[PDB]
Structure formats: C-alpha cells, structure tokens
Design a binder for this molecule. Structure first.
Ligand SMILES: [Cu+2]
Ligand SMILES: [Cu+2]
Ligand SMILES: [Cu+2]
Ligand SMILES: [Cu+2]
Ligand SMILES: [Cu+2]
Ligand SMILES: [Cu+2]
Lengths: 332, 332, 332
C-alpha cells in the first residue's frame, strides 16, 4: 500500500542546478512529492533583446530537474494560476500510461491537479507539456524539462563498477521558432490566439531561429558559467524535448555517456560528441584533468555559435603539461 | 545447390500489417518467393486533399514488409506493368552485391525480372527503388519499404534470453517534398518529366512538406489505429529510407530497441526515444502495461503534429493505479 | 620524461589516402611529429564550376588523417604562411585541455606554433580550426580533418578478437553554405571581411548548398574512386565536423562499426546505415564479398545525389551467384 511508504517533499531548484539527493538510495522506496507552478512570462532570449512569451514549469526554461530512484513514486502537484491564459498539462517520458500523464493533468488557469506515477525504469527522461492540438507550440515555447530516475545502487560503468559524481548539472536545450516577416525581422504578437498561426508557420520551416541552453543566448557564461575543479567527476544531464542535438565538451570528452539516457545500458566510453535525439534526455560523466575555460556546445557549430547553443565551464586547478603543452608558442 | 531447397511462396499484406511467419525457424533454409507489382498512382496525403503521384511497391506507401530468416534466399519477382510510365528497380539493404540488387533489376514499363539474394545478416533493413540519376525522387515518392531477416532462433535480449512478440506492426515513415510556389501553395504538374526539376528544387530545400506514417496524415488513427491488449508484447518495425527519425511511444517506452535494426547486437533497454538514421530500419519491442490511447510519433513534435508523423495505439484491458493514478483530478 | 622517448616524423598524405602506420604498435610510446601548413585557396566544388574560398589544413578538404597510438604524444607544428589572410588555430577532439589546443595555437599569417598533447583515448576524432568568434565559418570553409588513435594492440571485435584491415580510407564530409541571392544564384565576394556577414546569413539557414566527400562533387569517382578486391578488409574512417551524416555502402554493409568512433567500445555489427553526429568521426570495417561498383553515400539520398555526398568503390574479383544472382533478367 503506497500510503504505508515514507513521503519526502522536494523543493526544486533553478537549472542548471539540481535539488539535493543521494545517488545510492539511503531509504526504501518513497513517495517523492514535487510541486510545480506553471508560469507564462516574457523572456529575452538573445543579446539583441528579442522577447518571446515563454511557457514555463516553475518559471524557468528548462523546467527544473526532478530526481528520484527507481521504484519510487513521483507525486506531482501541478498548479496553473489564474494569471496564466492557456490550458496546460504534463507528460513524463518516465511514466507509464495516459500519455505519460498528459491525459490526466489538463489544467485550465485557476486549476491544479496531482498526479502520481511509479518510476519503473532508471534513466534521465524528458517531461513536457502536451495539450491536444497544441503540443509543439507549448514544447517549443520552453515548456519542458527532465527527470532523473537513479538506479537504487547508483550509477555503474560498462564493467558494473560504481560511478559516483561530485557535481551534477542539468543543461536544457531549447529550440525556438520566432516568426519572421518577408524581410526576416522577428514579428510581434498581441495575444496567444493571434500568435498561433504564425507560430505554426515558423515551426513548419523546421528551422529554429534560436537554440539556447538554460533559456537564453549566453545563459551559462560569465558569472553563470558552470564550474568544476581538476579531479572532479561531473555529470551533465542534457535534454532536448523536440529536436536532435549533439553535445560536446570542448577540450574534454564524455568519459562515460548514456547518449539516449537509460542506465540499465552500459555507457559509451570516451565520446567526443554524442547524439541526443529530440524527445530524449542523455547524460555524460566526465572527470576534469585540466584547468581553464571549456565550452560546452551543440556541435553543429552554427547552432552553437550563431543560434545560441553554447555554454562554458570554468575549471580551477593545476595545469598538466604532460597531457598538453605549447612547445613553441605562436611566433613569426 | 539452391534447387535442392524447399520453396515457399509468400503473399504479402498491406502495412502496417505483416505476412504470417514464425519467429523461430520451423524449417531449414528455404527459398522464399515474393512477388511485387509496381504501381504509380495518385495519393491524397493530408486532410486538405493534397494529391501527389506516388511511386509504390505493391500499391502502398510504404511497400510491404517481407519476412525471412537468416540464410534463407529471397527470390523476388518484380513486375513493372505497362500502365506505369517510369523505369524502376529495387535495392535491398539486406543484400550483398550489385547495389543491393539495383544494377540487376532495372525494369521498363511492361517488363519484369526475378532477383535472388542470400539474407546473410539478421535484422530489419530498408529496401527501395534507386534508378541511376533519379534515386531520391523515387524514394521520396514513396518507393521504399523494408525486409526483416530474423535470426533462425528468433529474437534475444541483452542477456541472450528469448524475446517473443505476440503482435508485430510495420510503420513506414515517408518524407514528401511537394513543390511550392512563391506564395507557398502546392504546385501542380502534368507529367513526370514536367514535374522533375521542380521535384528536385523542393527536395534540395531539405525541408519536407509532409512526413507521414503509412502514406498519409492520420493513416494509423481511428478505425486504422494500431491495437493491443495490456500484457501483449508488440514489435514495431519502423523504417525511414531517406531522412532521420526519432520514434517514441507516448505513454510507453521501447523496452528493447535495436535503433539501427541489426539483431546480432544487444538491444538498448528502456528507451524513451531512439534515433533511426535515414536509410535505416529499426525495431522496438514493448510489453503494454496500461490500457487506453497511446500516440506513436516521430518526436520532433513539429514533424509529428504539424507535418503528419503520428499514429495511435488503442489498447484494451485493466488500468493499473499503482503504475499511475490521478490523486487529485484537475479542479479550481 | 618525454625527451627520453623516440621521435618519429610523419609526412602526411592527401585524403582519401592515409599515411603509413602499423595497427599493432611495434614500439613503445613515441612522440609523433606532424607538420601542417594552412592554405587559404580557391576551390571548385561542383560540376557547374562554383568556386569558394576554402580554408585548408595542408591544402586539402578534408585535412589529412593523422595516425598514432594510444599514449603516444602528438606534436604538431602548424604553419600559417604570410600568403594567407586570416588567423587560424587547431582544436583536436582527441586532446585534453585548452579547447583541444585551440587556445594555444592561434597563428596570424606569417606565424607558426608547435603543440604537443598526449593521445590518452583510442578512437577516430575530428580536428578543426576554431578561432574565437569565427568558428563555424572556418569549419564550414573546409578547415577540419581527423586523427585516428589506435589501441596499442590494434582493433578488436565485440568478442575481443583481432580485427585487421588490409586497406584504410578517410572520407571527410563537408557541408558548405554558399550564399545565395533572392533568385537563388550563388553570390560572389571580393574579400574575406566583405564575405563574412553573408557567410553567417547562409549558415543560419541551416541548409547546406553542397555536401561533398573529399572536397567536391564527384571527388571519389572515376579515376579517383576508392578501390578494393573481393576478400579485402577495408576500414573507412568518416568525419563530419559540423553536421550529422548517415554513411551507407550501397550493396554492402558496415560489418563492424564504431558509429561515434571510440574503440574502447564494442562495434555495432552488420549495420546498413549508421549515424555519425556532427562534430564526430566514425569508422566502419567491411570485408568485400562481391566485385563491381559500389556507391558510398550519406543516406539522406537528397544530400547524396543532389548535394554531392556520394563516392564509389570499384571492386575487382569473382562474382558469387550464391550470394546474389539474376534468376530472370529484365524482359517484357
Ligand atoms: Cu503548456
Ligand atoms: Cu514526449
Ligand atoms: Cu522507382
Ligand atoms: Cu539505400
Ligand atoms: Cu581557420
Ligand atoms: Cu569541435
């Protein structure tokens, strides 16, 4: 009986950070309680000041990373305040039945609902909104995130030995389709309903106008760059709810990668770049060996450096000249 | 001597259904005889009534799924009736030599040919027409299908234990490139030769106008939805002869997936979404655990819900509230 | 101490050929010395005579394949002659630290530099230029290649048994984005700086105008077709520094494939087609079983046959009628 299980309430954090958890499960199965509040809000997504009407779980793009263990029950209270204008729901790729929960969680503004599902498969998974007839519009307005379902005994390598991360980050990658006029400037809209047909037209080009990490060009740089130390083991969970991506750590690797994110499989070793299919979350484990700045990108470099899909690590520690050195510095 | 082998004649069925076969081979190697008749025909591919000139094997898009076992010989009689206007051939990705059979099977209208090849590698494979100089036009006009070459002892999981499907479906996914004018309406053509340069121009955009399962928007819905029962093990073979796709069962998973379709490899477990590369067939095995409607989609959701790449399962049986339940139904 | 190690100097060859090497390492770790000279040069990339300003390592697109063994040190002298006009550098996906070497190798025209890095991970890897702010422009101007880091005991199959290739080829696949006017003709430019904004605009379409192997439409055909004999084991290393591809040997297979190119993983068997993500090198091993012409393509067949991503093998030897035969040749 589920009512006999411990309940634990989790307060979610903003990406790229992840709420506190234990890799190896320190209790038996639990009901893990999450609350998310849907927020429709204006967001500036690039340096030019382009502004879209984002559709968010808990105020951010992507929505926050939820973390549980296999055979836990996820119980989500989803709140759609009357300050929103649209109906929303949620579909968990981690769940089984009713369109991942979508058919059960349809909330008009001013409504709320509570869904519970059993996390029967270990892995990182996409979650996203999916209202009948308007699915890609909501997903491509930012209304998606991920959930990680850890094996009860934590992560394992291809030989079945433990892998333990010191830090974990969640990189949500978002394709936006800002409608353009004939001349190619971004078009502006007065209401959701007035925006919709132009939103559909832009999407159908299959050409994103922007592709960003954590909701905006440059969001994971500067003061908000990811950080680590030489010697630290870092897990980067990466999701793309609608379109393929190919993550790459410039100057590093994916030492162990579950490119399609499912932990009952052995990881792929020593990856330079890996393909995360649209509608998927993946995870990469890396131990840093050199200090300095790294870029973490979608390695369609146009998508990276022109459309926005690039962030940075700043890594502290000792430089290893055995691993790499400049023998003769650039000179004439 | 091949003439010493049993011969078995197979009458093919229309996708998404698959001709009768046994997973575990009940005989020694055989010559398996298939006949396909090429049909050029008009097809309505969307709700708006858009009509293209489809190029088909046996009257359908995709062509039918052929099923044999490893080390069987496939003997195909390919008929090009004089009511067609184009030369066609066939290339089997399952075969070895002469461009998969293409160099040997070139048939003008009013001709026929018989090809035999040995199915030396187990897996699902694309077949498609490929006439020199006009390959993508034929393939993207619908002239492709798949063949499944089963291991003689049937399918196995990642541990080498048997996997046995109760039902099997074949989902052919087709990218069409309907030429558009300046204003963006579909352009109309009086003959194949008159259509060709505009067909090439549309293809070169690399942007499909339609992406459909079983030949049309909505073809696998309603009375033609796929079906199953809770507890049933279902194999979905999925092919894309020209362009990448990322299949996903909404509300389910791929319990065991050969994303690139080759059965000597262990399957990937517990997949939410998987990448089938253009020019490939893949296969996913799932045991249904919940009743109700599922959508089965390409999880580029724009390709799914705007361009046509979505079908449904209707699944009967008992709802499992342990697996998923609405704790509090949507309310204000 | 690295100064105690043998030094070996390698003179690189032009793709698709590969400098001489041993699969099983015949010495202990070495410092392997390579020199590459950057050349900006005009290149004709199609049959129509379209001419771009290519940015090359050592005069070719792709740059040459470098070959070393795991735990060797790669020491590259990179020369940027004063006859070039741009600043360039190099990033090795095989290397660890300073953006793969990019942050250390920035050379203005008339400068040179020497980088050394330890090849700690076995596999095929992309290398490419990546100057801050101009990365995709350089990469999509042809300024990329690959490096193969062989396991010290050579290649292994999925069971840990030796795989030994008789021949090896390197296929570099290049996406170009030639800017077009309103009417769709290729636009012409007087200097790099004058070309740049239009180069960016074209790239942002995410639609290549050309996709070629070894630098031009038809480069691996005719007198320059790849060759082999029935019975020969051939390794095809394939790279795509910026955009996904899905290689396929028409009439053959990838008997053993490392689609994302990293040799500590078991290969995928019997592949028809495989996905190499942008920013990745992959490798396929095939034993030819039939003579004749094969095409080797990106199996988005529009990208292959319209945009340029197709080459040929010409294979000599004995035809095997057991494997494939025409039972009845095409006739009315
Ligand atoms: Cu929504
Ligand atoms: Cu989904
Ligand atoms: Cu045809
Ligand atoms: Cu093919
Ligand atoms: Cu450069
Ligand atoms: Cu790179």
């Amino acid at each position: 009986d589920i009512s006999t299980l411990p309940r634990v309430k989790v307060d979610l954090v903003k990406p790229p950070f992840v709420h506190a958890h234990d890799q190896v499960a320190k209790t038996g199965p639990r009901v893990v309680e999450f609350t998310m509040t849907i927020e429709e809000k204006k967001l500036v997504i690039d340096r030019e000041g382009t502004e879209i009407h984002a559709m968010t779980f808990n105020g951010s793009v992507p929505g926050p990373l939820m973390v549980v263990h296999e055979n836990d029950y996820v119980e989500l209270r989803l709140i759609n305040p009357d300050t929103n204008t649209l109906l929303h729901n949620i579909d968990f790729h981690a769940a089984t039945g009713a369109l991942g929960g979508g058919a059960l969680t349809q909330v008009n503004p001013g409504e709320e609902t509570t869904l519970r599902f059993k996390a029967t498969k270990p892995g990182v998974f996409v979650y996203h909104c999916a209202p009948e007839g308007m699915v890609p519009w909501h997903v491509t307005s930012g209304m998606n995130g991920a959930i990680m379902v850890l094996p009860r005994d934590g992560l394992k390598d291809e030989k079945g030995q433990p892998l333990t991360y010191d830090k974990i980050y969640y990189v949500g990658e978002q394709d936006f389709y800002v409608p353009k006029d004939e001349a190619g400037n971004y078009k502006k809209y007065e209401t959701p309903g007035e925006a919709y047909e132009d939103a559909v037209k832009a999407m159908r080009t299959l050409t994103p106008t922007h592709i960003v990490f954590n909701g905006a060009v440059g969001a994971l740089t500067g003061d908000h760059a990811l950080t680590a130390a030489v010697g630290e083991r870092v897990l980067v969970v990466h999701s793309q709810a609608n379109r393929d991506t190919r993550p790459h750590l410039i100057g590093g690797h994916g030492d162990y990668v579950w490119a399609t994110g499912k932990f009952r499989n052995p990881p792929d070793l020593d990856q330079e770049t890996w393909l995360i299919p649209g509608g998927t979350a993946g995870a990469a484990f890396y131990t840093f060996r050199q200090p300095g700045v790294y870029a973490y990108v979608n390695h369609n470099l146009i998508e990276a450096f022109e459309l926005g899909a690039a962030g940075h690590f700043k890594v502290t520690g000792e430089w290893n000249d055995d691993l790499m050195t400049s023998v003769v510095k650039p000179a004439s």
